[PDB]
Write a protein that binds this ligand. Structure first.
Ligand SMILES: *[C@@H]1O[C@H](CO)[C@@H](O[C@@H]2O[C@H](CO)[C@@H](O[C@@H]3O[C@H](CO[C@H]4O[C@H](CO[C@H]5O[C@H](CO)[C@@H](O)[C@H](O)[C@@H]5O[C@H]5O[C@H](CO)[C@@H](O)[C@H](O)[C@@H]5O)[C@@H](O)[C@H](O[C@H]5O[C@H](CO)[C@@H](O)[C@H](O)[C@@H]5O)[C@@H]4O)[C@@H](O)[C@H](O[C@H]4O[C@H](CO)[C@@H](O)[C@H](O)[C@@H]4O[C@H]4O[C@H](CO)[C@@H](O)[C@H](O)[C@@H]4O[C@H]4O[C@H](CO)[C@@H](O)[C@H](O)[C@@H]4O)[C@@H]3O)[C@H](O)[C@H]2NC(C)=O)[C@H](O)[C@H]1NC(C)=O
Ligand SMILES: *[C@@H]1O[C@H](CO)[C@@H](O[C@@H]2O[C@H](CO)[C@@H](O[C@@H]3O[C@H](CO[C@H]4O[C@H](CO)[C@@H](O)[C@H](O)[C@@H]4O)[C@@H](O)[C@H](O)[C@@H]3O)[C@H](O)[C@H]2NC(C)=O)[C@H](O)[C@H]1NC(C)=O
Ligand SMILES: *[C@@H]1O[C@H](CO)[C@@H](O[C@@H]2O[C@H](CO)[C@@H](O)[C@H](O)[C@H]2NC(C)=O)[C@H](O)[C@H]1NC(C)=O
Ligand code: NAG
Ligand code: NAG
Ligand code: NAG
Ligand code: NAG
Ligand code: NAG
Ligand code: NAG
Ligand code: NAG
Ligand code: NAG
Ligand code: NAG
Lengths: 226, 291, 211
């Protein structure tokens, strides 16, 4: 079928072009409608705009002279270029496939219908933060265990959200429990992952956590052992 | 009048003297574009012409069968000839005290609810070779016409004087739509063909139908209480050597009745939806090279 | 966009009324948006559902004008807790750029679960890096609302501790972290350090000593 995956800077400075991109899978780019949707904390869902299978532009008048939704059909790729960003523009940006319905109520010839749009398949979402603060890489520190035990990794002082934590590059996936981060007053987030493991495998079933933080181009790994 | 739009009738607001002679209220109402003219600010179309009287919202415009009787000592003569053209000697005469049930249908271009003809359809005239003489065609089988105003309107009582209550229009509940009519494309095709048949018995040539040369340009009648003005161009558009035909009707509330001495009438708005079904049994044509 | 609170019981029937009733013939969309997650198209036409939506999600059609649009969720679960939006498309109002307001459904009468506190001492590499951090991990508790207390031996701390607001989990329970930052000498100079997580009306203790 059809799936989507966005990808953006994750961090854009104030008064700048918030570029973005969304590649669709298993579907033609030029025979559906495509909508961009963002959602900030405290606010609700906001419909940015949408492009057609005819590549027609139509944006939310809430966003004045800012949005420009492009699309290049050589791949399955369509972009989104917000500019003159500010603090209120921090949100999760979603990429969804819109479909057109024609709701007829009177006579089709007299023009007694209206067009409604519904999004049926969405992207996962790209977190975007806006601030003059520079990017920051984390620094993992292992957490050693004590029938059943628990161990994990401490991802300290990074910016901005988010980080991805895999265990044994993806092998260990049962019992893994990555926790939500903590925005410290220093302005840096802090996360903590933890995996409940059988005490028999404590010695020795090798355990390594895989930390990825995209705004810093960092990929670090660390062992855990008593 | 300070008139808005909707998307056609304006949304007009205006100061009015009330039941108390020195207090002012600001009311709002809807008026079709044919009832108003720009002076933006607006006014009613008649105000530079004539005084207007609101039609009593209890008298009906229903065409009732009216019989015309001759006094004692007089007589009316009938004509039972089933192919009688307008003038000449009728060889089947009968005397009657009164005429039949006649409905005073106010219509234009298309005769509604009238008396059909027997045998075949007949056309009449004075001097048919004179182009400035109207042609009265009578049909033998009616073609069904169905008109409607689908907008669900509301009536508002505005007290503008002691006992004087002007009924206005305000707010359209539900969908905004278009007042129109419907006749069968096939039944109007076979009937226009029958009208084409006898336009040969009086002429030789090709028979072209075109639109008129909004009281007279369009089919104007009365549907449930409101006076339509239906564009009959999708009706007369043919040259003779399922599908519904729909006319786009406008709606007026102020009419100049018949004359133009200086009296107009305001038809109070009808509440809810309007739909009427009638029979077109006649036709009033006008002929104007090689055709 | 502001939030409209709604409370139903587990297993009953939900009735989410739209906040913007229609003026003409309508084409209403219903979206299930969980916070910080991909929205789910529940009902696109007035009552038509996509592939993969349970029958228990029903929408009201507009056969006769007047019937307002409501979302009916029969047999509510715990995972049905989310935001709900009413995208109103009607013939009178123009173009529906804005989604609905918000109807946050909170299901009442769920099984209450106790937290699973887990405290780790400071790491070896960070203690070498001249900084200490106690990580008191809390998980699988309902209702998601806990208060965290830190004890240096027997004395309260209150200084230099951060705490996560309880976030939800896949199994519909909640979790929250709790980081206590200490100087590497402060962590060694004290005999014990405790973490009290009093969830609902009871506290659970997890203590660790520098050995
Ligand atoms: C005078 O002359 C006039 C001119 O001749 C004449 O005008 C006519 O007036 C009438 C009434 O005023 C008009 O009737 C209306 O017609 C509307 C259009 O209906 C047509 O289209 C729909 C949709 O078609 C799409 O979907 C079907 C399948 O669903 C596909 O197969 C199609 O290919 C098409 O999909 C493509 O096209 C879309 C573009 O439209 C694209 O977006 C899409 O991607 C695809 O490319 C069809 O379903 C209709 O089929 C019906 O009719 C056929 C015969 O052709 C029958 O076999 C059968 O009965 C079918 O049901 C039709 O083809 C209607 O929308 C409208 O009815 C709705 O609106 C009114 C008021 O708004 C509601 O009260 C009513 O209940 C209907 O609402 C239902 O549907 C909407 C939208 O789907 C829902 O949101 C709503 O909840 C409700 O759903 C309920 O009912 C459904 C069944 O209807 C059911 O499925 C639901 O589950 C639920 O129960 C109304 O009927 C007519 O159009 C005028 N004519 C013209 C030419 O304009 C007039 O009558 C004359 N006389 C007078 C004035 O007296
Ligand atoms: C034709 O034009 C008319 C104006 O000349 C239109 O009438 C106006 O219509 C609007 C809505 O479109 C109304 O505004 C609403 O008012 C109600 C009433 O609430 C008010 O009172 C409470 C006190 O309880 C107060 O707290 C509110 O703030 C309001 O002041 C509100 O509930 C709505 O939210 C909205 O504000 C006007 O009131 C109304 N004016 C008049 C004089 O009737 C008419 O709708 C137009 N019609 C068409 C078909 O176009
Ligand atoms: C032609 O005659 C029919 C039938 O008498 C008229 O339809 C009536 O309209 C009135 C008012 O709209 C209704 O109260 C009646 O119930 C209708 N009767 C029927 C049988 O439908 C129709 O209005 C007439 N047409 C014209 C132009 O006068
Ligand atoms: C009614 O009179 C007042 C007088 O001040 C005026 O301001 C107002 O515009 C008038 N109303 C209309 C609809 O013209
Ligand atoms: C009244 O005003 C209208 C403006 O639409 C104009 O056409 C008409 O000739 C005027 N009539 C008189 C008698 O002034
Ligand atoms: C119109 O014609 C039909 C068919 O004969 C008839 O039933 C109906 O009464 C007629 N209506 C009028 C007003 O003459
Ligand atoms: C009607 O018929 C008479 C003779 O029957 C004829 O003189 C007259 O011209 C006819 N009327 C028309 C309008 O043709
Ligand atoms: C009919 O009109 C024509 C001119 O239009 C005229 O020549 C002819 O005499 C008229 N015939 C009658 C009977 O009036
Ligand atoms: C018209 O509107 C009224 C309310 O003003 C409502 O009671 C009635 O049902 C409506 N009729 C139709 C046919 O929609
Ligand atoms: C007109 O309406 C009548 C009754 O609603 C129906 O029997 C007839 O077929 C209609 N004809 C047309 C041309 O719409
Ligand atoms: C009647 O309709 C035709 C097209 O159907 C249009 O060209 C014409 O302008 C209309 N008549 C009037 C008076 O507007
Ligand atoms: C024609 O009109 C009649 C009534 O006006 C309606 O019942 C019928 O469905 C219409 N047919 C078409 C094809 O629009």
């Amino acid at each position: 079928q059809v799936q989507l995956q966005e990808s953006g800077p994750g961090l854009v400075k104030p008064s700048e072009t918030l570029s973005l991109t969304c590649t669709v899978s298993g579907g033609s780019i030029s025979n559906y409608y495509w909508s961009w949707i963002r959602q900030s904390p405290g606010k609700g869902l906001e419909w940015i705009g949408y492009i057609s299978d005819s590549e027609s532009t139509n944006y939310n008048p809430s966003l004045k002279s800012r949005v420009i939704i492009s699309v290049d059909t050589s791949k399955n790729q369509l972009s989104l270029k917000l500019n003159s960003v500010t603090a209120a523009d921090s949100a999760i940006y979603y990429c969804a496939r819109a479909q057109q319905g024609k709701r007829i109520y009177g006579m089709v010839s007299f023009g007694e219908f209206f067009y409604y749009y519904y999004m049926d398949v969405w992207g996962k979402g790209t977190t975007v933060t806006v601030s003059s603060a520079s990017t920051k890489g984390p620094s993992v520190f292992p957490l050693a265990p004590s029938g059943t035990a628990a161990l994990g990794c401490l991802v300290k002082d990074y910016f901005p959200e988010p980080v991805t934590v895999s265990w044994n590059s993806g092998a260990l996936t049962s019992g893994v429990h990555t926790f939500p981060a903590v925005l410290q007053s220093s302005g840096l987030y802090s996360l903590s992952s933890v995996v409940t493991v059988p005490s028999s495998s404590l010695g020795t079933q090798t355990y390594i956590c895989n930390v990825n933080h995209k705004p810093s181009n960092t990929k670090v790994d660390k062992k855990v052992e008593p | 009048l300070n008139c808005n739009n909707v998307n056609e009738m304006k949304n007009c607001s205006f100061n009015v003297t009330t039941s108390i002679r020195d207090k002012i209220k600001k009311e709002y109402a809807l008026f079709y574009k044919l009832d108003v003219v720009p002076l933006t600010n607006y006014r009613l179309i008649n105000c530079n012409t004539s005084v207007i009287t609101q039609a009593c919202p209890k008298v009906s415009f229903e065409p009732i069968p009216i019989h015309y009787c001759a006094p004692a000592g007089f007589a009316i003569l009938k004509c039972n000839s089933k192919t009688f053209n307008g003038s000449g000697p009728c060889t089947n005469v009968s005397t009657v005290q009164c005429t039949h049930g006649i409905r005073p249908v106010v219509s234009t271009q298309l005769l509604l609810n009238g008396s059909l003809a027997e045998e075949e359809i007949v056309i009449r005239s004075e001097n048919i070779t004179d182009n400035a003489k109207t042609i009265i065609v009578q049909l033998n089988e009616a073609v069904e016409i169905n008109c409607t105003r689908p907008n669900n309107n509301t009536r508002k009582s505005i007290h503008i004087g002691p006992g004087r209550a002007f009924y206005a229009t305000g707010d359209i509940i539900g969908n905004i739509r278009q007042a129109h009519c419907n006749i069968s494309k096939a039944r109007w095709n076979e009937t226009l063909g029958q009208i084409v048949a006898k336009l040969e018995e009086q002429f030789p040539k090709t028979i072209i139908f075109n639109h008129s040369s909004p009281e007279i340009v369009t089919h104007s009648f009365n549907c449930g209480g409101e006076f339509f003005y239906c564009n009959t161009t999708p009706l007369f558009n043919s040259t003779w050597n399922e599908q519904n035909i729909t006319l786009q009707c406008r709606i007026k509330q102020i009419i100049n009745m018949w004359q133009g001495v200086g009296k107009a009438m305001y038809a109070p708005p009808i509440r809810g939806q309007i739909r009427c079904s009638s029979n077109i049994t006649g036709l009033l044509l006008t002929r104007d090279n090689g055709t | 966009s502001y939030v409209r609170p709604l409370s139903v019981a587990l297993g009953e029937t939900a009735s989410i009324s739209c906040g913007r009733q229609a003026l003409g013939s309508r084409a209403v969309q219903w979206y299930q948006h969980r916070p910080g997650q991909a929205p789910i198209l529940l009902i696109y036409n007035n009552q038509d559902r996509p592939s993969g939506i349970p029958e228990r999600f029903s929408g009201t059609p507009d056969i006769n004008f007047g019937t307002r649009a409501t979302l009916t969720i029969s047999g509510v679960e715990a995972g049905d807790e989310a935001d709900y939006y009413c995208h109103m498309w009607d013939s009178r109002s123009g173009f529906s750029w804005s989604f609905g307001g918000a109807t946050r459904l909170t299901v009442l009468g769920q099984p209450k679960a106790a937290p699973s506190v887990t405290l780790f001492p400071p790491s070896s590499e960070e203690l070498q890096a001249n900084k200490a951090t106690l990580v008191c991990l809390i998980s699988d508790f309902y209702p998601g609302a806990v208060t965290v207390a830190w004890k240096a031996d027997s004395s309260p701390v209150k200084a230099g501790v951060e705490t996560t607001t309880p976030s939800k989990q896949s199994n519909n329970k909640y979790a929250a972290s709790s980081y206590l930052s200490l100087t590497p000498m402060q962590w060694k100079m004290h005999k014990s350090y405790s973490c009290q997580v009093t969830h609902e009306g009871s506290t659970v203790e997890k203590t660790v000593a520098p050995t």
